[model samples]
Target chain A: TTSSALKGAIQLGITHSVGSLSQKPERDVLMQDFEVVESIFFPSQGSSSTPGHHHGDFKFKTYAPIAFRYFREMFGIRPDDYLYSLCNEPLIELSNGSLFYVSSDDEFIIKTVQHKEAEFLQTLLPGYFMNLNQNMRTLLPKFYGLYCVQADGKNIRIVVMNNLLPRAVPMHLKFDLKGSTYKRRASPKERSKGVPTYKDLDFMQDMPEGILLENDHYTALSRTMQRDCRVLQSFKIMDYSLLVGIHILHMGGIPAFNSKGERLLVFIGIIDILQSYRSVHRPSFYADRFQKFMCSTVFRKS
Target chain B: TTSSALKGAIQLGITHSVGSLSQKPERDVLMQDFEVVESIFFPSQGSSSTPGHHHGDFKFKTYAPIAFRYFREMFGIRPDDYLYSLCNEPLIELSNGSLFYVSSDDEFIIKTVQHKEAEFLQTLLPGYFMNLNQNMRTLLPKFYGLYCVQADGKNIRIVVMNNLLPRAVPMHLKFDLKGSTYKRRASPKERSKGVPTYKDLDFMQDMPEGILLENDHYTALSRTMQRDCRVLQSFKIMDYSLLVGIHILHMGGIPAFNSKGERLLVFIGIIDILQSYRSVHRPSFYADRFQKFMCSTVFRKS
Candidate 1:
């Protein structure tokens, strides 16, 4: 009833890969710093230097530890806490074929990324820290670290990020918002579940209008999101979405159109940020200015 | 903020080493099964095969997986649950540098042993399983697994065993009880602590008389302990102790002698069973017939 290969390697890797760095003195994070790779050999009782073809070897590549370390620090994350959250708990595997894991304590989500996503994310780290340094209030995905585990001849790359959904307060309804709605709605089968991941069109038909916010909050969302988009555009990244969660509080928390609204809280996090436009017309895709459009409808300016 | 070397390797090793075996089908546990070692290589980012002489490597050896696996089954232990207890929670490090770790959930204890100790324990496994098969109720140290972790040029051999002390019930006093009492008393400094580990002589002076037991219970303990001692004698093992814990419950739990006694639970397990007599006097130690003497006083016929 247990699969340990990937999970074990990760639990082991994070404890070491994160810990060794934690033991060092503070240093300035460099923009051009690259990946740190560690090749580990495993030999059986035979005492042979050469590992079994399928078992004796695995390599770990931590992408830009210095950069990620700074990022974690900037996020107000303690190194010990991070290690404890990852190592002290057995991660719950998700069914998404997304190679997804819900970390214990509902604090983080671990998702194995493709090689392309891995390489692209590394390219963005050079500017990411600086960008995030100023955009602390940015609603984008809070990426904690990126890593790659090569074992049994398979490359397993993963990213650790903040979980947008809070376990304490269950979301009454959820939406995956990408302003572009062409063929972007929940399937019939999806809607049959107790809680289906609603997409753009389902969101459009349900509320009929975007969520309204206080002037101060609306202004904060606007500038922060815009600046965040600018950074992503410069990196040529796109195909992202705002995972908006609407929680109905026990008291006055209805989403009905009224000034005396139900006690409600909305959580939105920009996710799937690693997708980059291909060489085939990479310029025109995001240049069409769709990020701002998606931002527009998830929350109306009015 | 985090220290990972020994802990990380263990968390990783158990998952892989334990898991790889858990994958195989049930087979006859051979008596002469030896240690299983694996050389795991870790190369840093430079892509060089040579580890930092320290950073890029560790070797893991799991001794007699088949035997230990069967022992766990005999104890009605589930493999996944065992892994979760060790890996899912950060082990609490003990002050005594006995290289000790009180495993998460108070289910197990992990202690690093010397090479000689490791070799001696391995030799006993042949008789251990057969001995344990009959003495299901035996109070000897329940050795679940033995392992050696070689990394950064250090040989860390460890044994995994069941923890006799219950977490829910707090022990009012504890004792390390070897039969011979030449110098087996708690130190003045040790007695000052709220919970110091008492010793054989301490037990002698405190109670005046041994713990009295009814006939049914006394008979069970007598035979079980005698058989256990016989096994150890045959093993040429000595310098062992029965770590006895005395938990005094709120009502009628005091250790003072009376028929209307206070509610007290006495937990005893024969520990330090791996110590063996050297070439100087291997034959004379247990041949002196001291095991019966200690067991006799630890409990009285009444």
Candidate 2:
């Protein structure tokens, strides 16, 4: 299986990176470290009979592995568990423009990032890592690693991140909320396919009364989101979404309460922070719009 | 290269065993642990163009890995270094009666052990590990790992051990002395091809006076050998030989001064400790004889 080969590439790269044992440093990461990449080129081996051998010959590249390893440790991801999740089973690929893979365990979501996006992630890593160290709890995607594997003269870049919407729990309703009222709607065609991604206007009109959050959960969510967005704003990042998943209490889930003390669960994460204010879009058209849309519609204290 | 594939097998087995993290336990060794063997059967993969792909399909089996891992750490072999030595280079094949390989860096020697010998090593590991812990330094072969990989319907059992005859020093004379002089001279043919294994009588006649050791080295050697031989005797082991390789001081090596205060280095270790007393030999025919031979020929105070 090519999955095995890809996994072999992963294991070889990681084992080499982490096992180098030179992964020691107390000094803060500098610009040089983030720019560093460790690459192992595997040239094509002609036909041969071998056991547990991998094919689809590829070159594996890891960017800033030391820092990513540090980040993973901070996120409570054990090295062993990470390897098991990615290496033991074939990845379930789900994509929409970029290639997407959900680890067999559903603990990790591997998404293919184009070269541009990959470069963007590496650039913001220092700032992103610092905010994560300080805040500890934020909705931004937790990227465990960044890798690029070249096969057949093409570079396939991927990011291993925590899957906010794991399949272990079912979601009754889902929305990719940008919190903008301007022409944000899911098509009727999109609605026909299973579990459609509702947009800002759809969420507003559909759940007109608005979903509720407890005073404490709401406070924490508010604080975390404000810091997350402000930090994004500082980075001139825009067009990302708050992927919100709501589950009814009738089915099993980790419960959070509503205004009427109804049982419900919400899995939400701010995703795709790669989009920046690259265009001449007005500031009001970016973070300014998100702050207002979230302030009025996204919260209700019980 | 075949080296990479064999190394891949090693890396896969060890990572799976050690990374299981269930490796946590304060439990003492039971007969079951030693009996436990992790076997991975790799069916042959037909030819394919893959990078770093390996051929010569085989099955890899590791016996008592956790115990061996613990032993390696005690012997100052770090996990990273061990992997690098075995996985990074093609092993130098050197053999006698069984297949043998010296790690490229000469830090470790991997030797073929038949089924009977492999089982014996596993059986005695508990007792042997305990003695190593107590005495810390002994001439007994420090078995770091025992593995068997089946290739082409043959089980190649190998024991990874500390190489007493590291190539860093050039040996002037080498001998495998078993103490009994009944018919111990090297064969006429044996003396021609390469460094011949001169036996008990050959050593006695060739060096009229026994090689001398400093008072401190002599005391240490006496006490260590006594304890080591006694332990082997307890195991009912016999016929193992002391492999002594002498290097002259003119050439570079870790120098150890001797009898006339001339610089030289002597590398000696008691090897092949698997032979037992099942043949109804006299007690003097075993450890009793070795004790006398070693005392008379082996040491001298400065």
Candidate 3:
């Protein structure tokens, strides 16, 4: 299994040149804009459970250099320039802004399928949660967004996007097709509106160009090319797809999802509101998808 | 002087919010997209270079996290992503694919201006050179173009762009005055047909963007909108006075006349490009001042 991921990583490295897009000067112009609203990470980054186990918990830390180099090559962006600076400050500010928490009190460890990939995996996720809760399609910056612990002097600040009815609905993978049919067969009165929990709101967080939306969508706002970023192709193209991978353990392992239903995991992606080029749009859709992806995959491990 | 720059740094930090975008969805979208690229920085990162100085024959070594952090914040990019993985490989491969010469080098630790802004003077040249260097730019998935470099595994990777005839022309920084007059009083015969140099041609070798024609007049590529980047404000909406900054920089940088007396740097604008955006028209122009502005200025800078 480890080798499979490693092979995937190598293949990704090989196909690296394929997925790139050209900068439109106006692409992702929408993402450069921002919305002024309170987020759970807004004022407090505190944990919802015991530190470093569940929601927003300390997953792992990884270094970045390859990604930085790729952006430079693709965008014609100068490395010396602060084009990537968030409000002119360093991105670590976001790192500092983030907090972590334990979604469950279960202890976890690395499980290897192949030695080489196992070796790679061992070197990758310093902590168990970093590897377990991540979605299959997830990558680096998004991984950092999902993982990474902020060290405050001697204390590590933990955060949980608390999974419950209020903060977030608990994420429970369900596989009862008959039960679903029965539920769908229920009367309208039996259906739940299921007001968005905090975890639902988390879906409407931040994202990158091409990774989020598309150019046609961006142009619908303001078609001015100059207002768009010259750094990314189509300028409107947001970051690509979200990578999420789920796994099951038979013996026992820490519950990856938090009390707020937010999974304790890894993520990597651009988060600078301006640099990311897409921050806001259609919250209800995101809320639904966020809820869907986390709740419908109950499975059993052999 | 360093203190002043630090003060400016502090002011910059204090004045701007970490995620200060005018719209929220836009910011979120950008962050999500960067995830695909950010997945590259796994395990760890090796070494990197700081644009300011060099050691041991020009090999880029490691530097502070702050240096990396600056770009990270500005671009909302993470170094761990696959984006950089894709980018870094080419650079190394290209270097391996090229030729090199060993030129014995000397190291100098010259202490120059201590002022933060003044300190910029010492580094801006190399900084500019590095930033504008095409090879460095192309490595990023989001890049404008490429540059030519001669690698020696040391500091001998001379940039071809720096030697361009236009770049060789001294940077004339002044308004239209006697000594500052860029308009030639006399014309030379051979100067009429400006020929691209071997080095320039080599540098321009298969450049994704066409050759850098200095004869093309500068236009406002884009405004650094300190406010709303999404407002789609037309260039016509610009107040003539404030708009002069770009013009001033151009005029103070370009020569008005050549050997055969040709006006260099042709001016173009959004209106000219708008012909292609026929279906996307929005605003109207106020007057010919925009045209007049282009007819004037003749120089450029960092």
Candidate 4:
């Protein structure tokens, strides 16, 4: 599986130095103590024209020390401690046969993505970084780093981002909503999981008081979302979701721990923004807009 | 200093992964998780044809894991521990103004040499490896690996070899003998040092009992020396020396302990075989042999 292979690459990347196996030592000066480590390997003997020669080439790249600064602030990681918690265990169970791991401290999430998706994410990175530099308040993925690993003739890309849910909070319900109606409901197997990721239809059916919040907080959150969506639209992106988690308010104004002995609140952010504009997805994009309008109309009535 | 630089490289080599900075991960299959680690580095820019571009390349390799197997058997290095000693200190002060270090475990020695000398040593490696494979016993430098570092616009080559003296033994005196009379005396400054290395003339002056050994031991030592010399002569090497160390016996035939409490004995091996034969040094080679013959004659009389 790409997840295991990519994790292996990450393990190896941290274990090795930057200058090993290089024919050019002069250039190594630049790599000294750099946050990112990279390496490539090839078959011992094979001409470029030989069959499967391309498969012989494999590469691994990572951001280990370089991305730690941002994580330290975002997750309140201690300076004396490593960002990765001591246990080095995955965060949660997988439900969709797709691997996703949370940092031991529940401060970071590592998710595997297709090579094309990863490439698009990289292309959008500069603008994202700039946006963070300008605002640092958007409801978007707090990307920390990107990595690539090649194994078994396949290229796997991994991304590290801040987990939207705070480590100290308890989440009671979650949904992956794109404001679309077709094929948006959670599958039977997904529903069977302890924490099923519901869809837009399921969310509308369970609509309560529209995730109640103060007028100022609601304005701020909606404004940030609109701005984040604008950035995606500028890149011609579509097919993204607002991953939302709701911790129901305490009844009778009494607060109580939901599960892990922690106070809880809502968490929301945009995710999976890799899909770009193309002829086939034009209809899907328009439908997404229509669904957003419907959601706004509901929000106004609530 | 090259001593510290060499140690720095070894420090990194032992700590980092062998496959770091590889361009083709497939070829890493051949690395076999050896104890030794390797790494390479390149400058971020500059074409291959750019002037002074080649200086930007640096490489480092070691025999961390693979060589440990043989070293464990030969030197009794602990499997759970490093082959190098914890201190990682030099064995003794060098007299020739070259750098030399002994692993803290005293199992291995690292020495700096000219680029030409390093290349010559590499050229002889295949034959040496083959000879060892055949189990042909001889007293020769048991080279473990070769490394090159590009730094400060120069290429520094280093060789790793087994130390001749047993780690637990203590030598009271040492000498560098070439059988030549010219410039054959240790300098007064060298004489004042705690473990000064003496010369050929100094040996002749002391006139000790021909490094007293059992007849069988002497025969085996002489035979090994002869075979090693022949192999060296095949490559036209000259101007090398036999480095000999003597551990003194206490009165009443009791073996006296040096400060380190090691057994008293004799250690001998050929060293500094980096000098290649040149037309001008041809006469010196024959003279060296004649001097050896004279020393043997004198020994028989003593």
Q: What is the TM-score (0 to 1) of candidate 4?
A: 0.39
User: Runs in model 1 with CA error above 4 Å?
Assistant: A1-302, B1-3, B35-56, B250-260, B278-290
lDDT of each: 0.69, 0.71, 0.22, 0.54
Model 2, DockQ value?
Answer: 0.01
lDDT of 1 by residue, A121-224 (tens): 87766456545644677777778988877766778889999988857668778888766777788888778876678988888788766676665666776777
* Pairs in steric clash, model 2: none
Q: Candidate 3 at residue A219, lDDT? A: 32
Q: What is the TM-score of chain B alone in each candidate?
A: 0.86, 0.83, 0.21, 0.69
TM-score of 2: 0.46
Candidate 3: Cα lDDT at B237? 28
Instruction: Give the worst 10-residue stretch by lDDT in candidate 1 chain A.
Output: A251-260
The two-chain DockQ for each candidate, comma-separated, is 0.01, 0.01, 0.02, 0.01
Residue A26, candidate 4: C-alpha displacement in angstroms: 21
Give me the overall lDDT of model 4: 0.54
TM-score for every candidate vs. truth? 0.46, 0.46, 0.21, 0.39
Candidate 3, residue B190: CA error in Å?
37
Q: Looking at model 1, give its docking quality level.
A: incorrect
TM-score of 1: 0.46
Query: In candidate 1, what are the lDDT values of residues B1-302, reduced to their tens digit?
Result: 22366776677677777777877976434323344444444343322432233333576678878778878887878989988898768988775535778887888998889788888888777456545655678778888888877666767889988888757667777888766778888888788888789887888788666777655666777777776776776666787777877775653122333234665677778887777873645534553444565547766654
- A149 Cα displacement, candidate 4 (Å): 1.8
Tell me how large the interface RMSD of candidate 1 is. 29.5
Which portions of model 2 show Cα errors greater than 4 Å?
Answer: A1-31, A46-54, A251-261, A278-285, B1-302
Residues B1-302, model 3: lDDT tens digits: 23222222211221121122212222212211221211011111223411221211122111111222333333344433312322222211111022221111111011111223222222222222222222222111111111111123211111101101123233221111111212312234423332311111221232223212244422222221111112222211222111111111223232233323444332211211111111123322322332332223212212
